[PDB]
Design a protein around this ligand. Structure first.
Ligand SMILES: Cc1nc2ccc(Cl)cc2nc1C
Ligand SMILES: [Mg+2]
Ligand SMILES: [Zn+2]
Length: 313
């Protein structure tokens, strides 16, 4: 009950900042997550024995892929931690509990292939789940791990609180399907501008939590340039593997996934910052003013990609 996790001084200070990198020491990431749960939620939210057994089972069910791995899971949870810590009073006890777990679980059992590749391969998961294929799977795997003996970190919730938290986690994980982000942000944009945005309206909270999930999921574009640049290699290593597998099914991949068109990457990143990342952090900054550092860092990285194109690096 009185057992805190304490980090070294540099981590203790930097973990509060949006641009924190969890570092290359895998064995510290579980402790970093528990630390964040304790300060975000409380030391009483979860039985430590049960939380630790849940964390290690989640870790085991992330695969050894270049990007959609255990490090991505903990990175996305840290961004959620930073958003929640800078917006103390806007979120309920259940929401703080639910969203850190949703973030840690959001890409469970990812193989490093898009929903598109599953559909064109005719993967069984594509028959079981026609839309948000991987994301329905990630939610499935999360429930499976929650129902392992000793792994039910929510067992102290009432019946109805339990149903609410699993429903927060399901919507949170489904929302990480980027195909759903475009319409969600358009709607949040209209609502904020016409002044109809109302955070006591559950359907409006759902939408805002969805955008928070997109913002955390993309948070590698909000790091210091050397982290963003090196993470971009990992993301493109999966894209190029998927492009190779498209070619094996006799389909020319989109240029983003074609390893023969590496030269077009800087311009592809521009498109992605302008069409996805900047709009995402703009609308988020409009709804939650203290998340502005994510937008500032994202713009800095847009500028760095412009410099790559202009041959200045
Ligand atoms: C979709 C997408 N997601 C990303 C997430 C993180 C980083 Cl560094 C780069 C990314 N590039 C693209 C194209
Ligand atoms: Mg995902
Ligand atoms: Zn993800």
């Amino acid at each position: 009950g009185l057992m805190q996790f304490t980090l070294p001084v540099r981590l203790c200070k930097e973990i509060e900042l949006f641009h924190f990198d969890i570092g290359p020491f895998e064995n510290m990431w579980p402790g970093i997550f528990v630390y964040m749960v304790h300060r975000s939620c409380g030391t009483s939210c979860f039985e430590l024995e049960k939380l630790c057994r849940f964390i290690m089972s989640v870790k085991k069910n992330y695969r050894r892929v270049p990007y959609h791995n255990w490090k991505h899971a903990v990175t996305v949870a840290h961004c959620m931690y930073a958003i929640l810590q800078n917006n103390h009073t806007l979120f309920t006890d259940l929401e703080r509990k639910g969203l850190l777990i949703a973030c840690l679980c959001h890409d469970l059992d990812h193989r490093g292939f898009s929903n598109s590749y599953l559909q064109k391969f005719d993967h069984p998961l594509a028959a079981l789940y026609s839309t948000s294929t991987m994301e329905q799977h990630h939610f499935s795997q999360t429930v499976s791990i929650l129902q392992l003996e000793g792994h039910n970190i929510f067992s102290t919730l009432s019946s109805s609180e339990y149903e609410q938290v699993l429903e927060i986690i399901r919507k949170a994980i489904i929302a990480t399907d980027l195909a759903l982000y475009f319409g969600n942000r358009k709607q949040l944009e209209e609502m904020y501008q016409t002044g109809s945005l109302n955070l006591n309206n559950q359907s409006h909270r759902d939408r805002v939590i969805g955008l928070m999930m997109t913002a955390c999921d993309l948070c590698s574009v909000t790091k210091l340039w050397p982290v963003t640049k090196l993470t971009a290699n990992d993301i493109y290593a999966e894209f190029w593997a998927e492009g190779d597998e498209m070619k094996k099914l006799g389909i020319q991949p989109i240029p983003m996934m074609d390893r023969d068109k590496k030269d077009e990457v800087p311009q592809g990143q521009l498109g992605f910052y302008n069409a996805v990342a900047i709009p995402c952090y703009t609308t988020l900054t409009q709804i939650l003013p203290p998340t502005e550092p994510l937008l500032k860092a994202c713009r800095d990285n847009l500028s760095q990609w412009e410099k790559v194109i202009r041959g200045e690096e």
